[PDB]
Each structure stands twice: as C-alpha cells, then as structure tokens.
C-alpha cells in the first residue's frame, strides 16, 4: 500500500480515469460502471474499479492542485502499475469561443507552478499529453458527435487568480481555460514513462462571469464521462 | 456559497481548526465536540461547527498542498468571516532536534512553491504566523505539560522529494520538519488580515526512517487536538 | 517590405515549409517544386514560391536559434499573410527510443531560453504545435508508411552545450532530441494565431555517438521533404 | 581577531545589542552602561562591553545593508562566541497599523535581496527570529508598559526604493515597515545556530512622508534601548 | 572542419571582422580588400580572407541572435584559432545622446537572454569587450576624425520587442541602442580567452522613429568598415 | 542635507574618491591633501574636501556591500552634485593573471546581488564604468609606471562565500578579483548619469592563499591613491 491509497496491488486496472472530486468519482462508478467496487478511501479520496461494456476500468480522485494530483498520480504509476491516466476535470474558460459545459482537450499545460522548474534543470519543461491518447479522444469524440475544443490550458496554483488582467494574453496564446492539475499530471507521467491526457469541462467562464453550483459540477458533464469511458474501452 | 464550501454564511465560528485529512476533521468532531454539526461537504471535504467546554469552534478540512489549502482558507476568511485559523497537521521530521510524537509550532514556513513570489512582487515573502496565536499556543502547551518544538517548517510542493540530499541544509537553517500547507495558510492569512498558526505532529522521521504505528498515530494526534481546543477556548 | 524579407506582399502562399539552412530551402525549390521562383534573399536567407502536385507552396529559411527563427516567422505571418508553417529540420537524438533516419514530430518544445518567460508573464509556457497540423502529419505519415517518432524536443540556446550530463533527464522526460528553433516557432505561431508544427530528422545521436555519411544525410532528409509536401498538399 | 573586528576573544559578552549606526552604539555605552569600554573600531565600526544593572552586555555596530550586517554577525558568532544578538534599529513605516515613534518586533523579515536564495537552494527561506527572544521581548515590553507592534519587516537592498507603488501591497501582507538588515541578521543566525531578534523604531513614515524630529528620534530610541537592556538582563 | 564552417584550418587570419549579414561580409571583401578569396559558405553564411594595406584580415558572418552568434564565434576561436573578433553591425538607437549615422562602441552588452545565467552560476555576468581592443577603436577613431559614441548596448532575443515602454529606462542607464549579438559575442570571448569588441552603426532611432535612406546607410556603414579595417591594420 | 551625509551643499567638489573604510578616507585626507576639512560624519562615515596639486578634490566613505555603497553615491550625486566618482578599494584575487600588490581596473562588475535585476526589468544589466575615466586611469598609470591589470570583478553580497567551488569559473570569464561594491557604484552612476570607475589593490589571493603584510598593504594602497589623485587633477 501507499500513504494515500489503501488499495491492494492489482486492484487497479492499467487504465484509470481521474477527477479532483471524489464525489464525481463515486457518481461515475455508480452510474456508468457495472460491478464497481470501492477499492481505496484514504482521506475520503475514493477510488473504484468496475467494468464498462465488459472491459475493466478504474476511477481515482486526485484532489485539487498540482501537488495533490502529483501525489496520487505517482502512487498510481509506481505502486499500482497504472499505465494510462485520463483526467476528466473542470476548468474556468478564458477564451470567448468556449462556453459553459464545453469539453476541452489539453494539448499542453502551461503553469505558474515552480514544480516543473524544480524537476527540469530550472528550464522550461513543456508539459504535454501522450499523443496517442490525444488522438483516441479526437477519434472517439468525432464518432460520438462531441465537439472537442482543442488547445492549451493554464495549470495554476491559484483558483482565485491575482493576474486576471493577464487572461487576455493567455487566451491570445491559445490557452482556452485555467485549471489546477494538468501540468502536474503531464509532468509526472513524463517522469515515470506513463501515458496521460487531460479533458476538462467548462464549469466557470472567467471573462463573462458565469459559474456552476457545487452540485452541477458533478452532474452536468455526462458527455465528458462517456467520451472517457468509450475511448478507454 | 462558494464553489468548495456549501455552508450558509454564519455557520462557521470565527475560530477554526484545520486538517488536511477530512477524516481527521471527522475524528475531532465525533470525539471532542458537543452539538457537532456538519456544515459543508463539497468534494468530501468536511467542515463542522460545535462546542468545546461551552465555547463555539469550527473545523475544516483543506486537502494536500499549498494550492488546495489556499482555496479553503481564502473562502473561510473572505466569505465565512473566519478570523483565527489553527492548522494541526502531520509532518516528516528532518532535524535531530525532534523525534516521533513531537509537536512542532511553525514560527516560519519556507517553501519551494512559487506562490509567494507570484503574490509578493517576485521577492522573498517570509511566511509567518500571528504572534499572539503562537504565544497562546506556548502558554497553553506549558500549562498542559506539552513540550513544543519551535522552529521553521519547509512547506513543499513534493511529497516525493527530488532533493533529499538538501534536508541537512534545511535542518541546519532551523527547519524541523517538512509538510505541504503551512506556507499557503500563512501567506493567505497575511493577505487577508487574519490570524493563523500551524502546529505539526511528527508522524515519521525522514532521516532516521522511523515511523509510528497506526495506534500511536492517534494518541499523538490526541495531544495536539486538546492543545488546539484548549488554546481556542 | 520587411527588414528581413524583400519579397512583395502576395509573393508567399498561405502555406510554407521552413528550414534553418537556406541552401536546403534552395535545394527543395530546385528538386521538388515546379515553377520555382526565388522571392526573397535579404542576408542570404532565401525564400521561394512554387507548386507541388499543382498547388502553391512557399519555402523560407529562418536561421539558427530561437531569436532568428522568431524574426522570420513573425514577418511571414504578420506582413506576408502566411497561415500554416511546417518546420522540417535536423536534430541530435538523446533518447534510446529513436535511431538515425527517424523522423520526430515535436508535440512540445521545451527550452532553456528566456524568450517564453518574457512572452508569458515570467511563467512556464508549454510551447505546442497546432493539433490539426500534427494530425495531418500523423495521417500522411501513416499513408506513406513512415513510422513517426512522437514526443518532445528540447530547443536550446546552445549548440555547444554546458549541461551534457542532463541529456538523460531530458530523455527520461520524453525529450527525444535537441534542436534550436522549435520553441520559438511554436511560441510565435501561438502569439500570432497561426498553425505550426516542427518535424525533425535524426541526423546524429548524442548518446550513441553514432552518425552516418553525407549521402545518407540526404535520403532521410528526402523522406521528410515528401511527408511535408504531401501533408501540405 | 577577524578582518572587521579587532577585539580579543572574550571581549564580547555572549549577549550583544546591534545598531547599524556605530555612534548610536557609542551613545548607548556612554549614557546607559557602567564600566563601558570600547573593544573594537575597525573601519570606525565601534563596539563596546559594559554592565547594565550589574550584568554584562556587549554592543556592536553592523553598518547598512544585509551584506554588511551579515559580515559583522558572522564574525560575532563564529569568532567571538556571541549567542544572543538583539538588533535595535530604525525603519520606515508603510502600514497604517503603526505610527511615528512606535517600536516594531519583526517576527519575520521578507527581502528583495538574493542572499537567502543563494544560501537556501534557490527556494524561499522564511527568515525568522528566535522565539524565546521574541517572548522575552514581549514580556519585557508588557512589564515596561510599551505597546509593541508585532509583524513582518521588509529588509530591502534599497534605501531609495524603486517600488514605492508596492508599499500598500507590502503593508497588506503584514509588513509594518522597511529597514535594511533584519533578513541578513535572521538568516545568518539560522545558518549558525544562534538566537537573534530585531526591534525597530519607526522614525519615518514612508506613506505620510513625515519624520521624527532629531529630539523625538532620540526619545523613541531611548525607549527601545531600555526595553532591550531590560530584556537582556 | 566544424558543422557550420567549411574552411580549412588556417584560412582565417587571427583577426576577424564580423557582421550579422553575410552580404555585408561580401561587400567588404569586394569593395575594400585586396586578394580577397571566399573561404566558407555553409548555410550561405559567407566568410572571406584578404588584405588591407598589406596586412591580413578575415571576415565572417554570424547571423542574427545570440545563439547564432555563439555558434560561429565558438568555432572561430576553438577551431580556426581566431584571437581578435571585431563585430560591426547595425542597431536601433534609444538614447538621445546619439543620432543616425553615429557609430557606437559597446563597453557593455546587457541582455534579456538567459545564456549568461546558464553560463555564469545563475548570477549576473557583466558582459564586456577586451579593453585594449576598445582602446585601439578609440585612438583610431580620433585619428580618422570619427566621434565615437561610447556606452552600453542592449542585446535582445527580440527584434520585435514586447517591452517598448522600457526603452526609456534602458537609455537612462546608458544603453545607447539595441541589437541582438554583442552579449553573446562578449560572453563567448570571455569564456574562451579571446579579445572581442562590438561597434554599431545607428540605422534607426526607435524613439524619434527616424530612419536612414539607403545610400545614407551604405555611407554610414563605410565609415565603420574603415574604422574597423584601420584599427586592425 | 541628507540622512547619511551632514555636509552643506557646496562642501563637495565635483570629483570624489571613495573607499569602503572611512578610516582610509581619513588617512588619505591627512597624508595626501592640503587644507583638508572633514565635511561629513553621520554614522562615523567620514568625508573630506581638500587640495591636491592646487585643485579641489573630495573624499567619502561608502561602507561595505552594494546596498551601503548605493546609499552614499546616490546622495553624493543627487544632493551634493558630485559628477566623477572614483572608488579605490581592496579585493581578493581569484585569477592567475594577477598577484599581490597588483592594481586592478574594473571594466565590468558582475554580481550575485539582485539589485540590478530589480533596477533593470529583471534582465541582465552589464554594470560598467565610464570609458573616459577608465582611459584617464590607463594613461595616468602609463605615465606613473604602474602596470594595470584590466578586467572584470565580481561584486558579491558575501565576504564569507558559499560558492568557493566557482572561483575558477569566475576567473575563466575574466573576473580578476572579488570585492563587494563595484556593481552598485556602476549601476547607481548609470542610473543617475554620473561618471564612475573602480580601482582595487590586490591584498590577498583567495586561490594561492597568499597575503600582504600590513606594511605592504599600505605601500600598495599608496600607489593606488597616487594614481587616483593624479588622474583626478
Ligand atoms: O475558475 C477556475 N480557475 C482555476 N481552476 C478552475 N477549475 C474550475 N474552475 C476553475
Ligand atoms: O513525510 C512527510 N513528507 C511530506 N509531507 C508529509 N506529511 C506527513 N508526513 C510527511
Ligand atoms: O547536437 C545538436 N544540437 C542542436 N542541434 C543540432 N542539429 C544537429 N545536431 C544538433
Ligand atoms: O526609509 C527607510 N527605508 C529603509 N530603511 C530605513 N531606515 C530608516 N528609514 C528607512
Ligand atoms: O532596431 C533594432 N532593434 C532591435 N534589434 C535590431 N537589430 C538591428 N537593428 C535592430
Ligand atoms: O577577498 C575579499 N572578498 C570580498 N571583499 C574583500 N575586501 C578585501 N578582501 C576581500
């Protein structure tokens, strides 16, 4: 076991969906999986394994923030032998071409974190997903008729930004939304030779000032869930 | 409401104890509080209001890492009007001056995070607790027979450090242990003119590699809990 | 009509292949295009407009280094209305996962330059290609039986490096090779909202110390020229 | 002897007060100490030993800036075996919580210097004083009826600031005033396992642009001298 | 013998003139040297060797940007044993002490590049020319009747700047103009124990927006070519 | 007047010599000047005006460290209208190109301080002296028969260094010696459009560990004082 997962080894399938919200994890396990069992629950961070259309899949929560995500992704890879990690989270739009409930594929993850400078010689690590997972999602979304918005996200240490006047420059550089784990997911997967991709649904628009309740951040995003299950199966 | 706390404005007392683990927050409420009320549970992150020896007190989980801690503390101060915040968490010792079960009062929280450079003009913010809160802890500690270890902590973005060979330097400069939220608690409380303190129980030693039994984990925790509740009442 | 390009507005087609070496640009206009006409030659940096399988293509040299490349693709995009930019260049491999003759698709370009911190708020810009260009590249490579090697490159300010002891860490973090322009191309195309992608041919390999002859230095470069011209056509 | 102190080993009591101004040091010796004796004068940086209420106290000037303060307290600790160092200096208020003539106790010392990043792995060292001196100062102030103002200082490399528009932000983050040495004193004492504390007399207000007259400066200074002598004896 | 120069070892005289533009290199060989042969032309970057007033002089293009310049200057020194490198280029004035046609000698080259921090311990390398070279330049200019404008230059990674509001700050700090190589030339010559100096002809004034007509630029370059050839002979 | 200088305006001649140590300022005034008057003495930092070869010259101490130097030369320039500032200090040699007794002329001053980054856009300020002063120093040393060692120095925030491993790299990049103020003198004079130069006497060699006796220290210093006075008249 690990200090943050109390599952047995072999309890996780090699493919894992990830959310920050363990209650979103639990909702997916009960609604979309067959024969799902809760396999971990340290610090209330639920994880499950079940079957979707006969194929096995696991779900794990990773909390909020690069440091929290990095903790769970490292243990998933190093102890429980997960090899493919699909984050399906939420994000706050900064592009005007993206609206609430849009699905964003993160083809790179910029950050105001220092974690990647610490990892990578104090230079610029360009944190990116595994291309093949990235193409599976494009194909699967095409096949399901999901309009996937494709671009960079900005992975921040701040949910309440101190740099709102910089959102326009970020959008200009093809950052579609802000979220808080993708750079941590991408850089840890790169460190440990795993395959990762981040999808995110727009729960907030940071320009036009719309938002979603804590409840509809669990249940307004079924298209993203089905997309993730379908491409892992 | 806020996106991460579904309490009603007025449900929190102006004094709040904090843990990273929402189950540890749960342990405190069932074992030590009267009239304990669950007031929030977004993302399984639990918070409570109850009474200790007739005095109102709140409890809130904040998750792992500076980014996550910053979210909850920002919302507790800005929206729920919490004024005093006492973190009681776990840590890994790096100093020969402290051993397993020791309680550490963090008079400074160094960090490898970039969050305070972003906050504080790209300069060095010296993240520190409120002095009257630290004095109150020290007087209550002496009055209970607890021997406080008092020095800096190092709040890291990494649970799995890439710089273990630097722990000696950290301990040279009076860093007693490593945790992952203190700097975030301290900087947020400084930003928003609130009073904060971090207490940490040594649950592992990262140099001697000693750890505690899950049984001993709890009585050490019980000492820190009573100290915390006695300070606040 | 710009300081570094003396063509006339309109001389360039909206699609354009790029190399550092302007004699490869010259080589491609003479060997693969019909009606090859040289439109610019400031500072001996040659550009052409031709046709391949009937469709107008342009070519341009961008020089060595992020700063040179940035000057050229800036002026291409802003004044000469270019919209797609496909750099095809040579690199030194550092990863065990690629051998010589291999073609690399850079899904991200890390860097030791400061240019992106200057562009992007002193934060970490994940410099990435346009996704539909890298999709077009994947499909066209599939169709011509080329096995694209897909990962990050490291765009350095240094040809003669001072950190050769770090090439392993780069390759561990999925950096397949080193070159000197991708990060600038990707950032500039992001800034000015044009589509860009960088392909690289494994000229030599800086860990195996292996290389091979100038006659083979041209077969592998021919493969990449065809892939590039096919996907733009 | 050292390159900046020409006293004999043993000429310093293990407790030492410090000012930047050596004429302030001399003033303290003449007006408050019995059997006062000059013991060093290299570079006109005067130091003294003497007695207050029959107990031995030393006094030393340390000049202006972190660099100069660091030299003198490194030599006091390593060569002359000073164990407790109490800086009593002047400062410029930036916070509406203090006014002219106030005494500040610096529980933290932020900085725009690079010195702590060179000492401390390019991370953020939170430069803090020894807690028992802090407590001794708190108690002695109460005993004397002094209202001690407690928070951070900003130790700058600049007396004539280039960032006067950031003063409100610094005050927001609980920086009560600016001086030029407390961060060096704190970091050097942490490096060398000594006890240090910084007190400051507000002799200027950098926001209102008012300063204490010469005579008021001397009165404010006398209160701090008495507090310092009372707590060291 | 080097990947970027295809001359035999010995084609270069130990003194070399450099320009960014290899067609400026050519023009100097054809109009000013006797017995001028071409010695290198990889990537269309022309070098020559010839005679001026009976004495040997070489010419070498270095391309645009510090990374390009560092490649050529590194190979000139290390392989072709060049010992003195005189760079003569164009630049955009920012200071009111200089006008168009003025010739500038860079007694320092500031920079927004990271190359010198990578080279020099992540500190500030103050990149400067060889003093004896700068003394020849000065005495020769006096003999020829040229009024040299002497001060710092700012070597940028950007022809198209993102900090035009800061040109006034640069000019206040004795930066006479902006160009893109001197800092790389100076740093590389310092690393490898060679003598380097940069002269620059004011083509534009980025403040007054004034520019030179062609011819007028050709005649300003000529004054600098002769200064450069006289001081090497 | 100013907070660190109590002379009256007009008490300083426009030319002024500087040492870190005010007692050396005093020695110069008493041994080398006629009609010497002490004009300032705040904080025991002595300054003088007097005659040499019938011409007026001033002298001022500036303390140890960039921060302290910056204070004094800002006030000398802005309030007392000093226009030429010639620092004559002592230094620790690190290069094999120089031995004891040597006099170094600093054509640039590198640093580990953040002061210039804070002054200069967080880029690399190359801190340099006024060329005409350095030309005067060269010609006067020629006439006086002094052999000038000419190159960079490294201005450090540290007398007791944490980076002795790196002295050889510094010496490779033409840093002949280490001292603690040249970078601040140069940067402030640039800021405020004054003429500055630093000369340093080699009194210790930090590599060969050799040092001058006290007697030889004053003979070397007297050489440099005569050079300074002669070039200032
Ligand atoms: O508004 C946001 N900012 C940062 N991360 C987020 N994740 C969901 N919404 C947001
Ligand atoms: O071992 C530790 N390291 C980092 N964080 C921790 N939190 C509890 N223990 C530790
Ligand atoms: O080794 C290399 N480094 C950078 N660019 C290159 N292009 C060919 N080889 C290399
Ligand atoms: O204005 C101030 N700034 C810095 N240090 C000071 N010491 C007294 N006043 C000041
Ligand atoms: O005008 C200029 N600005 C920036 N870089 C340059 N390189 C040549 N001229 C210029
Ligand atoms: O070696 C030294 N280092 C820094 N400053 C000095 N001043 C005299 N010697 C030295």
JSON list of C-alpha atoms in Angstrom, two decimals, chain D residues 87-92 101-106 148-149 153 177-182 198-203 220 224:
[
{"chain": "D", "resi": 87, "resn": "UNK", "atom": "CA", "xyz": [19.27, 44.41, 16.71]},
{"chain": "D", "resi": 88, "resn": "UNK", "atom": "CA", "xyz": [17.63, 47.72, 17.65]},
{"chain": "D", "resi": 89, "resn": "UNK", "atom": "CA", "xyz": [17.44, 49.89, 14.53]},
{"chain": "D", "resi": 90, "resn": "UNK", "atom": "CA", "xyz": [15.29, 52.45, 12.71]},
{"chain": "D", "resi": 91, "resn": "UNK", "atom": "CA", "xyz": [12.75, 51.82, 9.99]},
{"chain": "D", "resi": 92, "resn": "UNK", "atom": "CA", "xyz": [10.27, 53.46, 7.67]},
{"chain": "D", "resi": 101, "resn": "UNK", "atom": "CA", "xyz": [7.76, 56.57, 17.49]},
{"chain": "D", "resi": 102, "resn": "UNK", "atom": "CA", "xyz": [6.35, 53.02, 17.60]},
{"chain": "D", "resi": 103, "resn": "UNK", "atom": "CA", "xyz": [8.57, 50.03, 18.36]},
{"chain": "D", "resi": 104, "resn": "UNK", "atom": "CA", "xyz": [8.23, 47.06, 15.98]},
{"chain": "D", "resi": 105, "resn": "UNK", "atom": "CA", "xyz": [9.18, 43.49, 16.77]},
{"chain": "D", "resi": 106, "resn": "UNK", "atom": "CA", "xyz": [10.00, 41.74, 13.46]},
{"chain": "D", "resi": 148, "resn": "UNK", "atom": "CA", "xyz": [4.97, 46.59, 20.95]},
{"chain": "D", "resi": 149, "resn": "UNK", "atom": "CA", "xyz": [3.82, 46.47, 17.30]},
{"chain": "D", "resi": 153, "resn": "UNK", "atom": "CA", "xyz": [9.51, 43.90, 8.17]},
{"chain": "D", "resi": 177, "resn": "UNK", "atom": "CA", "xyz": [7.95, 48.93, 7.92]},
{"chain": "D", "resi": 178, "resn": "UNK", "atom": "CA", "xyz": [11.08, 48.74, 5.75]},
{"chain": "D", "resi": 179, "resn": "UNK", "atom": "CA", "xyz": [14.63, 48.51, 7.04]},
{"chain": "D", "resi": 180, "resn": "UNK", "atom": "CA", "xyz": [17.81, 47.05, 5.54]},
{"chain": "D", "resi": 181, "resn": "UNK", "atom": "CA", "xyz": [19.33, 44.32, 7.75]},
{"chain": "D", "resi": 182, "resn": "UNK", "atom": "CA", "xyz": [16.82, 42.15, 9.65]},
{"chain": "D", "resi": 198, "resn": "UNK", "atom": "CA", "xyz": [15.16, 42.58, 15.54]},
{"chain": "D", "resi": 199, "resn": "UNK", "atom": "CA", "xyz": [13.35, 45.56, 17.06]},
{"chain": "D", "resi": 200, "resn": "UNK", "atom": "CA", "xyz": [12.81, 48.80, 15.17]},
{"chain": "D", "resi": 201, "resn": "UNK", "atom": "CA", "xyz": [11.87, 52.36, 16.00]},
{"chain": "D", "resi": 202, "resn": "UNK", "atom": "CA", "xyz": [9.57, 53.96, 13.43]},
{"chain": "D", "resi": 203, "resn": "UNK", "atom": "CA", "xyz": [11.42, 57.19, 12.71]},
{"chain": "D", "resi": 220, "resn": "UNK", "atom": "CA", "xyz": [11.95, 56.94, 20.66]},
{"chain": "D", "resi": 224, "resn": "UNK", "atom": "CA", "xyz": [13.87, 50.85, 22.67]}
]
